[PDB]
Nucleic acid binder design. Structure first.
Ligand SMILES: Nc1ncnc2c1ncn2[C@@H]1O[C@H](COP(=O)(O)OP(=O)(O)O)[C@@H](O)[C@H]1O
Ligand code: BEF
Ligand SMILES: [Mg+2]
Ligand SMILES: [Zn+2]
Lengths: 343, 364, 369, 249
RNA sequence: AGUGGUGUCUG
DNA sequence: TTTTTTTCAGACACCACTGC
């Protein structure tokens, strides 16, 4: 199939419409805008009737097959849509997706929306049979190092003037929150029809919504950015994240750091990285962290992490978020006191 | 004020025009611009904090939508239809307590009411308070209606915890986030309310009430009515302060402040207060431990203060900047030891008192 | 005074309350929409039941002393009291304060009521179509199209039924996106042309109000509401907005081939083919040749039925794919012995109608073959 | 399978007889009560009579029917599930019913098939002491006449605890009900009676079930005072008795 | 109303 | 490239499908 970013989708849609469109990724906003563009282009070429379905173990597949095979009294040119579940094309769903891949026709246009597909796990069969004459659209959230240029492009295409300061403020409050970021730009356009956004204008009309995953917290710890890591920790506290997930995500990299710092006396860090199968972008930040106050924080932090783990897993009142703040501050070149470490 | 003062300040004082709303200027300005320019989204999700006006803003927006003078940011005065929202009932404006009617059947009836024409107003406006409580199937039905809503239907959703709303609902709703009111705004609105109620008030009592409100204007209004209750139709500073102290539960922070300052009589007075309130003592020790731990983390890095403790920011700063880390370490160790030995004491009260006595006796 | 002096037998009150109850009984949107509205006026009792969209009113004659009062009382409790009291018991209900007293021979009840000023009433509207019609004609008009209505479709206009007043005839139209049912009958009177979309609930209640006697069913339609008078029962229902799909366009424009057969044989053949039709991808295939009609379906079992010699045909050999539900419902609604279908093309839709009775016409959009 | 070679009691009983015997007592059982001995029906055998007793500590129901065959006195508690499913399978009154009760399990041969169940270990209470021992007030009424009046009163009854006050005066009976909404229902009925004015407040569902169990035309109620129980039965027989212990509200 | 499932939150 | 969670016990809340 044609693998495509949202940038050229319009162009591809102007070239022609394929049998099936697969909108995949973890970003609600990018998927939604891609689906809207696809539906508008389809309606331009006569696809008037729409449908929606949620791919679920309790869905009625017979209705989908009936509407795909049969035609309607009006608006014969029809389109169909399916929301894939959180996990993806379950093993009980691949066969019926294959049937749909057989039950299609040039009259119908299929839209597939859901999270990213683990291609290493799921491939061929359904995937290749669509790949015959289909389009894959990858709509994933831009990361922190990439978000500012995305926001600049969005401001340019919405006819706004964003300076670097407003851009970084917007990139600060809204991460993993591209939907609310676009809504914030829309609200700022509504607030001032001038279209010129400065620092105070965006600063006043913005909330610290954000959305982080424990990987962001662990990366912030490895870079040793105190404010960034603490902001991430507060955000996962407010979001309601399970602290034990944070514990495991930090523990994996912390034990890797302990192993690397212990073995670095006999082997350069490059061969250790190769031994443990760690990737290059990970390699850079882990090399930055390994020579940043090591051999003391790597056992003191393991001690504090064990304290948090046992306290979390014995009682039911939790109250481990402050201890996680202690960890966030220990691994960022801000030494703590033995009083809180030992307990 | 009213015909015998039974009518509550909270409900009697509710905005009827956009200008009577206290400074939630963001949503008001954006909505006024959208209404005047004709740029209308299908749904207008409102959110924020309790008692900061999201239901008031939604009601005023419904009034502006269905007013016969046209889509205006300023609903007029008489406009019988535009009046029916406040006094009596309006046919086309449906107000649903989504907390009372969470079921997919109760919302099914109204989503089947969607396709019928509005009686008088232009828009079949829906005001769904506490929208986060609809079940999964109620949310599915609401989303299905939000995909292709008719041009005569608008949805107004208000909630306090939007995180429970699905992303599918949030993508179709232009969420307007309301920020917790400042102490100045709350104090000014309370001043205006009391001045127009012909209620004798002292300036300091208003600031005390605003600080005690925790950013919610309705909290300030309820505390104000209660303060008038504690007295005879006058909001006196002494009565308000006594009422606030009676309602006060911030014992651990005051205990840490007085223990670090080495103020034995104040510490014992605060322990007496915590005893008279029937406050758990192990919980008191845990709160003091958490406060000391947070003070230390702030001393390490100013970013350790999250948005969960915006009420007690300044004091924390004052304690973190002025107290060396050695003293905080010693006090944390002392209170940890005391909480460890709390069960084996004459009673919890004496155990907490003795732990605080040790912490004072350290004098480091 | 406060007492809405009221006195009637049970025999003349059980059926009117049973009619007025309607949708009441469950959880209402507003707490008052579970209470029947009782009104006394000019020697008549008015029973009213409202759902904020439907309005059922019953009139009962008063031949005993009465007082002009009105109040709303819980529907289920009042009905349970009314039927609980013995046969021929002269109910005497009066009012005082906020409680109304029900009385019978050697029995008393007290019920909590709400004011009549708060109970909703559907606003008066101007009517453009004043229409009167016999009972059986309306019964057939509804029954011949109710099957083809949408089932909670996302398209509002698909739900409900279309009423068209054209010249001397009234027409009922129903569509679900794949079927079309049209029933047009003369009414003996001239009316202005008008088009109205009636919701599913209104159609169901219209079918419900039908009596086995001879009473002129009076239909009065405005721009946003429909009203039906049947004896002393009055029904008001608001309408569904939008545009109904123009049934004239979906009607096969220029048919050229046609099959003629009977209702019972086709019914049996399609019922037999249904068993060999999978629920997944439900449908049938019709092989049509000269005086030949073979009905099969898609199924892994790969079965077949053949009754080709029971049909008359004069066109070319070709195939059209219907669905089990569509054809079964259409033939069931076509009770006449003879039946015929207009095959135009495999892509185009097919008309089912009687050999000489074209008033009830159905249009089925086939599959893609 | 059948290791219960010896049985304590044996019955060759008509199906209709036990159908009435259970139907006249089933509604008074206890469902998932903490008193495990009350979560069942007591079959009691004495002389030629078999009795079913069911109580939940708020109502007692006893029903006795002759058999003709002399049997030793015995007591057994059949749990709720066993007796309910035996009642369900007890159809086709033409075929007789065989009953085989041992010390630990019960068997019922219905038609051609066999049913097996276990027993409740506890010992059922003595119902003779629950029955009032000095009924000084006796009143009579019509079963349907009384029942319809109770139903009409129960229409406006407290939905949580369906309770009515029954007053007895000279040749007159009064049933008064109210709900938390103060909706008052009052029914007055003509009875034959001789005694003193007395009020007693008891549940409505229990009395209605008692009346439905007695498919008769004349009903006799026996009462002692406002605080003790009421013994309801029919006036055409003494084979079925019911004890309703009132509320103190 | 009985039964079974999903899911979320409290220690 | 992906990479993400202990537990036993209990309390609600909603939504089939049944059964009258
Ligand atoms: N912006 C505001 N202006 C004036 N009063 C307010 C405002 N916000 C809250 N209130 C007061 O609080 C009371 C309840 O407000 P409400 O808007 O219902 O809060 P919520 O957002 O939690 O639904 C109102 O009657 C009003 O007195
Ligand atoms: F009405 Be609010 F959300 F407290
Ligand atoms: Mg609210
Ligand atoms: Zn107005």
């Amino acid at each position: 199939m044609i693998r495509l970013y949202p940038e050229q989708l319009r162009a591809q849609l102007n070239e022609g419409l394929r049998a099936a469109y697969l909108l995949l990724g973890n970003d609600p906003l990018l998927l939604q805008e891609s689906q809207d563009a696809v539906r508008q282009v389809a309606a331009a070429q006569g696809f008037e009737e729409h449908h929606t379905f949620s791919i679920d173990p309790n869905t009625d597949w017979n209705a989908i097959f009936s509407l795909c095979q049969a035609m309607s009294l009006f608006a014969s040119r029809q389109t169909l849509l399916l929301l894939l579940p959180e996990n993806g094309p379950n093993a009980a769903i691949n066969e019926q997706l294959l049937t749909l891949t057989g039950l299609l026709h040039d009259d119908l246009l299929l839209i597939v929306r859901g999270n990213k597909l683990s291609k290493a796990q799921e491939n061929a069969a359904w995937f290749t049979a669509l790949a015959n004459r289909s389009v894959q659209v990858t709509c994933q959230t831009p990361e922190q190092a990439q978000l500012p240029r995305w926001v600049a492009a969005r401001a340019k295409q919405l006819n706004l003037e964003l300076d670097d300061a407003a851009n970084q403020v917007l990139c600060y409050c809204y991460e993993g929150n591209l939907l609310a970021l676009a809504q914030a730009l829309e609200r700022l356009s509504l607030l001032w029809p001038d279209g010129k956004l400065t620092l105070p204008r965006v600063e006043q009309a913005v909330n610290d919504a954000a959305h982080f995953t424990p990987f962001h917290w662990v990366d912030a710890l490895l870079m040793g950015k105190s404010k960034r890591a603490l902001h991430i920790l507060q955000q996962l506290r407010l979001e309601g994240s399970e602290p034990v997930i944070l514990l495991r995500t930090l523990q994996r990299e912390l034990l890797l750091l302990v192993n690397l710092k212990r073995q670095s006396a006999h082997t350069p860090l490059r061969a250790l990285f190769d031994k443990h199968r760690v990737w290059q972008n990970r390699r850079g930040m882990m090399g930055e962290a390994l020579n940043r106050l090591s051999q003391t924080q790597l056992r003191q932090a393991v001690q504090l992490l064990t304290r948090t783990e046992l306290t979390l897993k014995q009682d039911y009142g939790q109250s481990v978020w402050a201890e996680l703040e202690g960890l966030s501050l220990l691994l960022c070149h801000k030494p703590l006191a033995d009083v809180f470490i030992d307990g | 004020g009213p015909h015998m003062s039974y009518q509550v300040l909270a409900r009697k004082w509710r905005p009827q025009t956009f200008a009577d709303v206290v400074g939630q200027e963001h949503v008001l300005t954006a909505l006024a611009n959208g209404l005047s320019l004709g740029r209308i989204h299908h749904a207008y999700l409102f959110s924020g904090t309790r008692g900061v006006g999201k239901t008031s803003i939604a009601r005023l927006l419904a009034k502006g939508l269905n007013c016969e003078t046209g889509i205006t940011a300023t609903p007029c005065g008489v406009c019988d239809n535009c009046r029916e929202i406040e006094q009596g009932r309006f046919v086309d404006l449906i107000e649903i307590d989504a907390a009372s009617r969470t079921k997919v059947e109760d919302t099914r009836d109204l989503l089947d009411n969607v396709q019928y024409a509005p009686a008088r107003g232009r828009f079949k406006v829906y005001l769904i308070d506490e929208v986060h409580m609809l079940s999964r199937h109620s949310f599915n039905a609401l989303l299905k209606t939000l995909e292709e809503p008719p041009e005569h239907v608008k949805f107004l959703l208000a909630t306090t915890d939007p995180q429970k709303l699905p992303v599918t609902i949030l993508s179709r709703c232009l969420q307007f986030h309301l920020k917790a009111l400042d102490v100045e705004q709350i104090r000014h609105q309370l001043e205006h309310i009391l001045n127009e109620e012909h209620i004798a008030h002292e300036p300091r009592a208003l600031q005390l009430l605003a600080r005690a409100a925790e950013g919610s204007l309705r909290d300030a209004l309820s505390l104000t009515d209660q303060a008038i209750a504690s007295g005879d139709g006058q909001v006196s500073t002494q009565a308000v302060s006594a009422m606030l102290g009676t309602l006060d539960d911030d014992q651990a922070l005051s205990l840490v402040e007085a223990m670090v300052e080495a103020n034995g009589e104040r510490v014992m007075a605060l322990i007496n207060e915590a005893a008279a309130r029937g406050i758990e003592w192990e919980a008191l020790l845990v709160e003091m431990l958490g406060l000391l731990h947070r003070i230390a983390m702030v001393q390490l890095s100013p970013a350790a203060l999250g948005n969960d403790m915006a009420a007690i920011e300044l004091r924390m700063r004052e304690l973190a900047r002025t107290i060396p880390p050695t003293d905080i370490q010693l006090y944390y160790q002392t209170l940890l030891i005391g909480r460890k030995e709390l069960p084996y004491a004459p009673d919890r009260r004496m155990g907490v008192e003795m732990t605080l006595l040790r912490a004072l006796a350290f004098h480091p | 005074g406060p007492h809405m002096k009221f006195t009637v037998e049970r025999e003349h009150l059980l059926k009117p309350l049973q009619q007025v109850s309607g949708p009441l009984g469950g959880r209402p949107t507003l707490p008052i929409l579970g209470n029947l509205l009782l009104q006394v006026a000019d020697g008549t009792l008015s029973l009213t039941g409202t759902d904020l969209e439907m309005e059922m009113v019953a009139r009962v004659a008063l031949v005993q002393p009465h007082e002009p009062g009105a109040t709303t009382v819980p529907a289920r409790k009042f009905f349970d009291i009314c039927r609980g009291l013995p046969e021929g018991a002269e109910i005497a209900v009066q009012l005082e304060g906020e409680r109304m007293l029900v009385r019978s021979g050697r029995s008393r009840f007290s019920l909590s009521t709400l004011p009549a000023a708060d109970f909703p009433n559907l606003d008066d509207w101007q009517s453009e179509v004043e229409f009167t019609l016999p009972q059986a004609t309306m019964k057939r008009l509804i029954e011949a199209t109710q099957f083809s209505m949408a089932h909670q479709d996302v398209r509002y206009y698909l739900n409900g039924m279309l009423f068209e007043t054209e010249g001397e005839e009234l027409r009922t139209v129903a569509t679900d996106g794949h079927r079309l049912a049209v029933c047009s009958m003369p009414i003996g009177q001239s009316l202005p042309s008008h088009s109205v979309i009636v919701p599913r609930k209104g159609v169901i209640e219209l079918m419900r109000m039908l009596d086995g006697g001879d009473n002129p069913l009076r239909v009065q339609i405005g721009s946003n509401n429909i009203r039906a008078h049947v004896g002393d029962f009055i029904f008001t229902s608001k309408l569904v907005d939008g545009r109904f799909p123009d049934y004239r366009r979906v009607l096969p424009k220029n048919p050229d081939k046609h099959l003629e057969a009977g209702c019972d044989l086709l019914k049996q053949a399609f019922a037999r083919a249904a068993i060999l039709s999978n629920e997944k991808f439900r449908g049938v295939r019709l092989y049509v040749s000269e005086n030949q009609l073979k009905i099969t379906a898609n199924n892994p079992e790969q079965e077949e039925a053949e009754e080709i010699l029971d049909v008359t045909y004069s066109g070319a050999e070709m195939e059209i794919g219907f669905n089990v539900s569509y054809v079964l419902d259409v033939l069931n609604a076509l009770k006449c012995e003879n039946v015929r279908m207009m095959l135009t093309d495999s892509v185009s839709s097919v008309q089912i109608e009687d050999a000489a009775s074209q008033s009830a016409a159905y249009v089925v959009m086939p599959m893609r073959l």
